[PDB]
Design an enzyme around this catalytic site. Sequence first.
Site, mmCIF file in Angstrom:
data_model
loop_
_atom_site.group_PDB
_atom_site.id
_atom_site.type_symbol
_atom_site.label_atom_id
_atom_site.label_comp_id
_atom_site.label_asym_id
_atom_site.label_seq_id
_atom_site.Cartn_x
_atom_site.Cartn_y
_atom_site.Cartn_z
ATOM 1 N N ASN A 105 44.076 29.867 32.599
ATOM 2 C CA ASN A 105 42.552 30.113 31.849
ATOM 3 C C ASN A 105 41.293 31.015 32.141
ATOM 4 O OD1 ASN A 105 44.381 28.053 29.758
ATOM 5 N ND2 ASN A 105 43.006 26.515 30.088
ATOM 6 N N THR A 155 68.092 56.503 38.028
ATOM 7 C CA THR A 155 68.323 56.248 36.309
ATOM 8 C C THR A 155 69.264 57.182 35.413
ATOM 9 O OG1 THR A 155 66.139 54.682 37.202
ATOM 10 C CG2 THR A 155 66.530 55.461 34.245
ATOM 11 N N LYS A 157 69.055 58.798 31.824
ATOM 12 C CA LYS A 157 67.761 60.169 31.301
ATOM 13 C C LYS A 157 68.928 60.759 30.422
ATOM 14 C CE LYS A 157 65.298 58.279 34.192
ATOM 15 N NZ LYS A 157 63.908 57.198 33.504
ATOM 16 N N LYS A 159 65.771 58.254 28.548
ATOM 17 C CA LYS A 159 66.091 56.795 29.101
ATOM 18 C C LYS A 159 66.679 55.563 27.692
ATOM 19 C CE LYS A 159 61.671 55.100 29.237
ATOM 20 N NZ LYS A 159 61.635 54.607 31.218
ATOM 21 N N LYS A 183 71.553 53.376 37.456
ATOM 22 C CA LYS A 183 71.186 52.203 36.839
ATOM 23 C C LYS A 183 70.670 52.276 34.860
ATOM 24 C CE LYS A 183 66.626 50.548 37.183
ATOM 25 N NZ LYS A 183 65.842 50.985 35.660
ATOM 26 N N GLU A 186 64.564 50.254 32.355
ATOM 27 C CA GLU A 186 63.759 49.482 31.741
ATOM 28 C C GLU A 186 64.058 48.388 30.397
ATOM 29 O OE1 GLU A 186 61.765 51.326 33.358
ATOM 30 O OE2 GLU A 186 61.302 52.011 31.220
ATOM 31 N N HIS A 276 63.638 44.977 37.960
ATOM 32 C CA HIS A 276 62.641 45.246 37.747
ATOM 33 C C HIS A 276 61.183 45.471 36.836
ATOM 34 C CE1 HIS A 276 60.274 48.795 35.124
ATOM 35 N NE2 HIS A 276 61.359 50.218 35.363
ATOM 36 N N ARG A 277 60.123 45.858 37.364
ATOM 37 C CA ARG A 277 58.965 45.335 37.579
ATOM 38 C C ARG A 277 58.163 45.680 35.666
ATOM 39 N NH1 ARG A 277 54.524 48.205 42.646
ATOM 40 N NH2 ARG A 277 55.578 49.991 41.890
ATOM 41 N N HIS A 309 60.886 46.918 42.482
ATOM 42 C CA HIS A 309 60.886 48.343 43.167
ATOM 43 C C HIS A 309 59.009 47.448 43.898
ATOM 44 C CE1 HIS A 309 62.997 50.978 39.877
ATOM 45 N NE2 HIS A 309 63.576 49.419 40.364
ATOM 46 N N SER A 361 60.756 53.885 43.374
ATOM 47 C CA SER A 361 61.767 55.501 42.566
ATOM 48 C C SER A 361 60.869 55.672 41.510
ATOM 49 C CB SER A 361 62.601 54.067 41.313
ATOM 50 O OG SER A 361 62.468 54.730 40.303
HETATM 51 O O1 LIG Z 1 61.654 54.683 33.242
HETATM 52 C C1 LIG Z 1 61.182 55.548 34.829
HETATM 53 O O2 LIG Z 1 60.666 56.384 34.804
HETATM 54 C C2 LIG Z 1 62.453 54.865 36.403
HETATM 55 O O3 LIG Z 1 63.453 54.905 35.519
HETATM 56 C C3 LIG Z 1 61.916 56.593 36.694
HETATM 57 O O4 LIG Z 1 62.491 57.062 36.084
HETATM 58 P P1 LIG Z 1 62.434 58.989 37.489
HETATM 59 O O5 LIG Z 1 63.636 58.749 38.683
HETATM 60 O O6 LIG Z 1 62.920 59.972 36.302
HETATM 61 O O7 LIG Z 1 61.708 59.471 37.789
HETATM 62 C C4 LIG Z 1 61.541 53.993 36.451
HETATM 63 O O8 LIG Z 1 61.728 52.393 35.958
HETATM 64 C C5 LIG Z 1 60.297 54.011 37.664
HETATM 65 O O9 LIG Z 1 60.528 54.322 38.985
HETATM 66 C C6 LIG Z 1 59.963 52.467 37.900
HETATM 67 O O10 LIG Z 1 58.098 53.078 38.181
HETATM 68 P P2 LIG Z 1 57.999 51.264 39.195
HETATM 69 O O11 LIG Z 1 59.677 52.364 40.033
HETATM 70 O O12 LIG Z 1 57.412 51.963 40.481
HETATM 71 O O13 LIG Z 1 58.267 50.036 38.871
HETATM 72 O O1 LIG Z 2 42.670 23.914 29.870
HETATM 73 C C1 LIG Z 2 41.505 24.040 29.301
HETATM 74 O O2 LIG Z 2 40.194 24.098 29.851
HETATM 75 C C2 LIG Z 2 41.619 23.464 27.924
HETATM 76 O O3 LIG Z 2 42.191 22.309 28.143
HETATM 77 C C3 LIG Z 2 40.253 22.863 27.620
HETATM 78 O O4 LIG Z 2 40.179 22.120 27.899
HETATM 79 P P1 LIG Z 2 38.989 21.582 27.654
HETATM 80 O O5 LIG Z 2 38.780 20.859 25.815
HETATM 81 O O6 LIG Z 2 37.730 20.212 28.149
HETATM 82 O O7 LIG Z 2 37.391 22.237 27.586
HETATM 83 C C4 LIG Z 2 42.573 23.873 27.183
HETATM 84 O O8 LIG Z 2 43.434 24.858 27.637
HETATM 85 C C5 LIG Z 2 41.561 25.842 27.784
HETATM 86 O O9 LIG Z 2 40.518 25.465 26.321
HETATM 87 C C6 LIG Z 2 42.829 26.771 26.780
HETATM 88 O O10 LIG Z 2 41.759 28.021 26.445
HETATM 89 P P2 LIG Z 2 42.885 29.171 25.183
HETATM 90 O O11 LIG Z 2 41.943 27.856 24.601
HETATM 91 O O12 LIG Z 2 40.720 29.975 25.085
HETATM 92 O O13 LIG Z 2 43.645 29.507 25.105
HETATM 93 MG MG LIG Z 3 43.806 23.331 29.289
HETATM 94 MG MG LIG Z 4 63.088 53.347 33.994
#
Ligand SMILES: O=C(O)[C@@](O)(COP(=O)(O)O)[C@H](O)[C@H](O)COP(=O)(O)O
Ligand SMILES: O=C(O)[C@@](O)(COP(=O)(O)O)[C@H](O)[C@H](O)COP(=O)(O)O
Ligand SMILES: [Mg+2]
Ligand SMILES: [Mg+2]
Lengths: 449, 451, 99, 105, 102, 105
Positions: A105, A155, A157, A159, A183, A186, A276-277, A309, A361
Site C-alpha cells: 500500500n 526470439t 519473429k 512475434k 524462444k 513473451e 521473461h521479465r 533478461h 536481448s
Molecule cells: O519482444 C522482443 O522485442 C524480444 O523478443 C526481442 O526481439 P528482437 O531480438 O527481434 O529485438 C525480447 O522479448 C526483448 O529483448 C525483451 O526485452 P528485454 O530483454 O529488455 O526484457
Molecule cells: O493496510 C491498510 O492500510 C488497510 O487495511 C486500511 O487500514 P485502515 O482502515 O486502518 O486505514 C487497507 O489495506 C487499505 O485501505 C488498502 O488501500 P486501498 O483500499 O486504497 O487499496
Molecule cells: Mg490492509
Molecule cells: Mg519478445
Amino acid sequence: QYEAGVRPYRETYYDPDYEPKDTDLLCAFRITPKPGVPMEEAAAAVAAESSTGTWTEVWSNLLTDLERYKARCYRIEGDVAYIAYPLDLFEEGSIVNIMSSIVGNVFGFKAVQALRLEDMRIPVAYLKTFPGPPTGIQVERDRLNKYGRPLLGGTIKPKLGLSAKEYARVVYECLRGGLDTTKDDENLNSQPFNRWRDRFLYVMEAVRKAEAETGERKGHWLNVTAGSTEEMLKRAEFAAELGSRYIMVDFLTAGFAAFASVRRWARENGLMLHCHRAMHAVFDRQPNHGIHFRVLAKWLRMVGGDHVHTGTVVGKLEGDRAETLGIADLLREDYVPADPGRGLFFDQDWAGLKPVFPVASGGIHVWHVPDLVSIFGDDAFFLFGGGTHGHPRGSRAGATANRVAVEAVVQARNEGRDILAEGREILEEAARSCPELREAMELWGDVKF
Amino acid sequence: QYEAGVRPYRETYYDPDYEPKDTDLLCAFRITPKPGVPMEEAAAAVAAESSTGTWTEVWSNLLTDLERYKARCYRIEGDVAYIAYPLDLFEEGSIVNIMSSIVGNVFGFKAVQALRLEDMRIPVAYLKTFPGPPTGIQVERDRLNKYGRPLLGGTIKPKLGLSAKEYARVVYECLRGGLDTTKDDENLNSQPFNRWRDRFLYVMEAVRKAEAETGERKGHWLNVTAGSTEEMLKRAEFAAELGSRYIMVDFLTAGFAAFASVRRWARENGLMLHCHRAMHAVFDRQPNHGIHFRVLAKWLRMVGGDHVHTGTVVGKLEGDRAETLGIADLLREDYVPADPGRGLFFDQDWAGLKPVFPVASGGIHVWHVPDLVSIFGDDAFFLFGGGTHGHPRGSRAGATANRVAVEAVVQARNEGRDILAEGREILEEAARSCPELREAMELWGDVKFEV
Amino acid sequence: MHTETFSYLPPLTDEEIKKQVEYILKNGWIPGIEYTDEPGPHNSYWSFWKLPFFNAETAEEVMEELEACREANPDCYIKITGYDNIRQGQVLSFVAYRP
Amino acid sequence: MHTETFSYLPPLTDEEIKKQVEYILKNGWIPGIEYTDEPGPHNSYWSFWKLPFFNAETAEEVMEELEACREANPDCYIKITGYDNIRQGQVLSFVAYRPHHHHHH
Amino acid sequence: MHTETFSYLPPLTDEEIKKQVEYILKNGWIPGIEYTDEPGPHNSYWSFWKLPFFNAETAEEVMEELEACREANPDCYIKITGYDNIRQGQVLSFVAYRPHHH
Amino acid sequence: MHTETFSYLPPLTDEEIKKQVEYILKNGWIPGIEYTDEPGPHNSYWSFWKLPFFNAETAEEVMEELEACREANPDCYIKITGYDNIRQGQVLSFVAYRPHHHHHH
Ligand SMILES: O=C(O)[C@@](O)(COP(=O)(O)O)[C@H](O)[C@H](O)COP(=O)(O)O
Ligand SMILES: O=C(O)[C@@](O)(COP(=O)(O)O)[C@H](O)[C@H](O)COP(=O)(O)O
Ligand SMILES: [Mg+2]
Ligand SMILES: [Mg+2]
C-alpha cells in the site's frame, strides 16, 4: 484503558539509533514527500504502513510486542530512507508476502507523492527459506555440454501470426544454423493462429532434427505462460513428455505465486526454466517511482529462474551500463558487496543459492558482439531475433553469422586482444571466411541505438 | 528474396486510415517520445513491439498476413496514441496474455521515454471468453440478507503481531458491535506469530459467535494469499471446510495466473472472493508512466473478483473523485460510456458479466460517511480498521459508531435530506442517541486529508 | 462445572484474589476481567468487562472493577485474566466469582 | 437480536416508517410486509402479510396494512420490504415493529 | 559434426590452440585433455587422457600431452578443457584435433 | 514411397508441373521448392532450396529453379510447395522429381 488518537508516524516508526540486525530485511526507499511533510515523517509512514501500523492508535497494539515486530526507519541519507524489517514479519519462502508488505500500500499514500524501492538486503536466514534456480548456471552448462563462450539464442519473429507448423520451420532453420536455443515471444502463449499443443509438438521435431544434423545439443524456450496456473502446469507437463530441455514463463505477468508453482514443477520434471521479465518497465524504469530491476532480479533468483533478461545497454531497450553490471553480479555471484557507483545499496550474501544466467536481448546484431562480450563475459545468453531472421538470406544464414561473431570475439579475447579497440577488425577478419557474417555486417553497419 | 533492413516503425504500424472493428481491443496510451522521435514513430514502435513487429524486417513476415494480425496506431490526439489490436492476437480468458502483449516490453524502449496506459476497450467477442465475478452484488446481498445500505467492514489491526486467538478476539468485538465483515491485512498471510491454520479456525469461531449473538449474518475475509498457487488453494480449501462465506486474495501480488486459479476454485466451492489491490500503486500512481487503475479494474472484473478496493477519495490514500466515479461505474454497470474527464477514453460494454462491489478503505472515520454515501451510493463496502479499533472504548464501540453513522446517513438520504449539505448535522443528530458515535466524532474531528 | 486454574481449591476470598492480581502486576502482565453465563468448554470468548486494564497501576483498581462487574452481572461467572504481550499469550486465568 | 437496516437507530416512529415507504414508492419499487417470531440468521423467508403490494399507490395504504399486521401479530417482528423487479432484488428492508419482549431483556 | 566452442571458426592451428591453453593457465584454471570416437550429443563423458593437469605450469607441457594423445588416438576427436575448482565447473572446452574421417 | 498429392498419378512432365505452378501463382500463392532423401511420414521439414519464392512473377522462373535443384540433388525427392500467407498454410504441395531408384524396386 489506552491513549486513543492520531500520533505522527515518526513517534513509533522512526528510530535513528536502531542498529540493524543481520536477520533484518533492509529496504532502501527513495522518498518524494508531499510538500510540507518532513522526510522523517514520510519515512516513518512507509515503515508503519508496511509492517504493523495504521493511521491512528489502536487498543490492540498493546496485545503484542511492537518493539520486536515493527519496521523502523533507522537512517536517512538525502531522499533515501533505510527501513529495517524484523525477520519474523515475513512468510518463509514467499516473494508474494514480501511484496504484500514492502510494496503493498505504501506507494499510494497522499503523504508520499512518489516512492521507489531501490534495493533490498535479503538476510541469509530468510534466503535459506527459498530454493533458488531449478538448474543454475553450472548444471545448465553441464546439461547442454557447452563451455567457454556466451550461449546463442533468438526470439522467433514475427512475434505473433505464424502457424504452429511454419513457426517450427523458423526454429529449425535457426537451430541448424548454429543458435543454441530459440524462444517463443513473451506474448506467444496459445492463440487462434498458433495453439500451444501444435507448437510444442512441431518445435520439438525441429529441435530434434537440428540436434541430429549439427551434433550439438539444442533447445527451445517453450512458453507455458497462460491464464491460470493449472494451464501453465499442463503445458509444462507436455513439454516434459516431449523431452524438451526447456520451458519459459513470463514471471511478472503470470505473477509470483504461479511462478513458484512452475519452478517446482520444472525442477521435479527435469526442465530448465527461462524467465521473461515482461511488464517490468511499467514500474522499474522511472527513477522517481516503482521498484528497481535489481530488486526484481533478487526475487527472481530466490524463487528460482535459470535465466532472466537483463537488458543489452546497446540495443533497442533502455539499459544503464553501471546498473546492468551490478545486476549481473547479483544474478551470478555468491556475494556482492555494496557499491554506490552501481546503485548497490547493501552487501548481498547469496547463502549458496544457485546462479542465474543474464540474458541480453533486443535490437542487437553482430556489430554489438564485442561490447556484449566485454559487458557480460561468458556466462550469458545473447539473443538475436530480428538480428537472425532479418539476415539477407534468412534465418539459417543469420544464425551462422551470429554464432561466428560470438566465437570469433571470444577467441580474440582469449588470445589477449583488446576486443573493444579491435572489435571491428576481429569481425572483419572472421567475415573473410564467413560470407554470412560479411552480409550481416553490411546490412546493419549503420544501425545504432 | 525479400527486402531486408531496418525501416521506420511508422511505415507498417501507423495507419490513421484504419477503422477499428467491433472485435478489436483498443488501447489509449499517453506517450512521451524521446526528444527528436516523432509522435507517429513512437506510437508505431509501441504498436509494432506489442503485436507482430521487431526492429528490422524479417523474411518470415511474408509467411503470415500482417494486415490481419498487426496492431496499428490509428489516431494520435494530443499526447494520446490510439492503438487497435485484432481479436486474433489474444488468448481467450487470459488476462496474463493481455498484459504480455499490451504492457510486455513497450514501456522500456529507448525511443519512448515515458508511457502511460490510460484505458483499454475490451471487445465483447473477447470479453465473453471470461466468466466475470462468481457472485456479484445482488447475489451477495441475498446471501448476507443485507439490503438498502452500504456494507461495513474493517481490517484487523495491528497489521501483524497478534496471536491467532487474540486476532479473533478483535474480530469478535468488531462483528458483535455491528460490522458486517472484518478482514485480514493484505500482508497477513502465514507468519511465526500468527500461522494461517490457527487464524482461520479461531476467526471462524468468532464469526459464528458474533452471528449468533447479534442475529445478523457475518463474514471475515480470510487471506489465502501465499507463495505458491498450491498453497493458496490449500488455504481456500480450509476456509471452505470451516464454512466461511469468504476468502480474500491479493490479486496483484499473488498475480493473475494464481488469481484465475483461485477464481475457478471459488466457482467450484461457492465462496465469495474479496480482492485486495496491494501493489497497484507501484504501477498506477504517476500520471506520466505506468498503467492507470481503471485498466486493472477492468481486468479484475473480467477474471471475476466479487469485490475490489477502489479508493476512498477522502482518506489516507490517493484517489481523485472523478476517476474514482469512473472506476465505480466500470465495476458496477452493464455499459459505461466514454468520458475522458474521468479518464475513460472508450465506452465499455460488460454484456451481462456480474458487477463487482467497490470497497472504500483507508484512513476513513465517521465524519467521512456522508461523502462516502454521496460518492458510492448503497452498493459499496466501507472499511474502518483504525477507525474501528482506534475508538476510545475499543473495537465493539468503534464498530457500533461506524454502523450507526452509515445507517443515519442512509435514513436521512431516503427521507429526502441533502446528505452533503446536511451531512455533519445528520451525524450530530444521530450522536444524540449513540454515545459511541459521539466519542468517535470527538476523537477524529480534526483529522482530515487533502482532496 | 470446573473452571480451570484454582477450580480444585476452595473458592477464593477477595484477599486471595487480590494476591493473584498483585502477581499479575508484579510480573508486568496486563490484568483483565471477563464474564459469561456460558462457562463451558465450547466457549473460548467470554465477555470483556471494559478492555484489558493496560493502565492499571494497583491491584486495588482491579478489585474495584471486579466488584463493579459482580454487581452488574451477579448471575455470571467472572474470571480474572493476566496477558503477556511479549509472548502474545494469556499467562494466568481463574474464576473469581461464581453465581 | 439486531434486524439489519436501521436496527442500530432508535426504533422508527410511524412517521419515520412512512417516509421510508415513500422512498420505496417514489423510486418505483414494490413495498411489502413480512413477519416472523424467528428473526435470526438461519431464516431467509419470513411469512408474507398478503403478497407484495404490487398495486399500492400511496404510503398510507401500506401504513394501513402495517397497522393490521401488527394488530394481528403483536408477538412477531414485522418488516417492510422494498423490491425492485428490474434488478430482481430487495433494495430496502427494515423492521417496523418489534414485540414487547425485545426491549425488556 | 559440430564440436561446440570454436566449431564455427576455421579449425585451429597449433599456435591458436596454444593461445587458448595459455588463457586457461593465465586464469589459474586446470587444463585437461579428453578424447572419443563418439563425439555426438549423447556423450557427456569423453575419455580422459591421464588426469586433469593439476600440476601443469606451462602451455608447452599441455601441448606435448595433446600431441601424445593424438599419436595414440589418431582416429579420435581430442578436446582441451579448462576446469575451475572454485566454481566447480568447466570454464572452456574446445576440439583441438579432428580425425581424418571428419 | 507415396508422396501425397498427385503421387497416385503418373509422374508429372515438366509441362504438367509448370501448369501446377501457374495455378499457384494465378491464385496469388507463394511457390517454393524443397528436397530430401528421407521423404517418409516422420519428416515434416524437408530442406529448403532457397527461401520460398516470394518475388517470383512467372512459372518459368520457378521451373528454372526446379531444374537447378534437380541437377544439384539428383539423389533426392524434390517437391513444389504453394503457400498462402493469408491463411498461414500450404494450399498445394506435390513431388516434381523422384530419384532413379524410386522406379526400380
Ligand atoms: O519482444 C522482443 O522485442 C524480444 O523478443 C526481442 O526481439 P528482437 O531480438 O527481434 O529485438 C525480447 O522479448 C526483448 O529483448 C525483451 O526485452 P528485454 O530483454 O529488455 O526484457
Ligand atoms: O493496510 C491498510 O492500510 C488497510 O487495511 C486500511 O487500514 P485502515 O482502515 O486502518 O486505514 C487497507 O489495506 C487499505 O485501505 C488498502 O488501500 P486501498 O483500499 O486504497 O487499496
Ligand atoms: Mg490492509
Ligand atoms: Mg519478445
